[PDB]
Design a protein around this nucleic acid. Structure first.
Lengths: 60, 69
RNA sequence: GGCGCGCGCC
RNA sequence: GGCGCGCGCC
């Protein structure tokens, strides 16, 4: 999973664990110096999308 | 909403409602795959996915696509 | 939500 | 023990 993978990355890198804001659906994810917001039809999807976005901005 | 669109088609056409059946269940507990068969009127299609819900949606979409054909 | 069956990282 | 994720059933 993107969330699981994001976590493992942080733990691996020695970064403080990812932080997700309370779902509002949009959820903002922050890890290291990254900040990405995800949207979706459910809170679960928003979180997943925020994670995927962060990993993507990480690869670039 | 494929499942819903297919049901409406059937009702509008005067067909008995679509019937969905689990044709196959496989894979390890954490990565299962399901296959569902969708039968309506004279059509029969199969759909697969990570969950029974998803497989059902796929089976319905395929049947509608076969219907337009 | 409960029950159950699993997996990843630490 | 902790964090996370997946599926079924109710």
């Amino acid at each position: 999973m993107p969330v699981g993978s994001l976590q493992e990355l942080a733990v691996q890198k020695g970064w403080r664990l990812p932080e997700y804001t309370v779902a509002q659906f949009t959820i903002t994810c922050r890890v290291e110096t990254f900040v990405e917001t995800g949207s979706g039809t459910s809170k679960q999807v928003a979180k997943r999308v925020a994670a995927e976005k962060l990993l993507t901005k990480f690869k670039t």
